[PDB]
């Protein structure tokens, strides 16, 4: 069943969506999706 | 002179500030979900 999420896609070179993650399912995807990015450097993050 | 005097005086110089951060979806909306999309938006400007 479909809940109403924030997702963050990944597009590669070619266009097709690889390696998403689901923001708002822990606090490390959290700051995932307001980092813009799926690399996370060491150190402390505020989230929401 | 002929003579002195041993003066103590002090200065107080500010070192540091007060941290703060700030939640824009809870600040821009109480908790409001119609509020928080359309926020979506702007979520560049409150990343910065
Ligand atoms: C994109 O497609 C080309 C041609 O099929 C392929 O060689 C390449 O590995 C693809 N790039 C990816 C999957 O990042
Ligand atoms: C210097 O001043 C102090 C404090 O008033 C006093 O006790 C002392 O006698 C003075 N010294 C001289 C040489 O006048």
Do not use: W
Request: proline share 3%.
């Amino acid at each position: 069943h479909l809940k109403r999420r924030t997702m963050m896609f990944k597009y590669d070179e070619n266009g097709t969506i690889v390696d998403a993650i689901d923001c708002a399912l822990d606090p490390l995807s959290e700051t995932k999706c307001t980092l813009r990015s799926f690399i996370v450097e060491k150190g402390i993050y505020q989230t929401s | 002179p002929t003579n002195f005097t041993i003066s103590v005086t002090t200065e107080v110089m500010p070192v540091s500030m007060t941290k703060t951060s700030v939640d824009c979806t809870m600040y821009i909306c109480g908790d409001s979900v119609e509020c928080s999309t359309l926020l979506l938006q702007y979520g560049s400007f409150c990343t910065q």
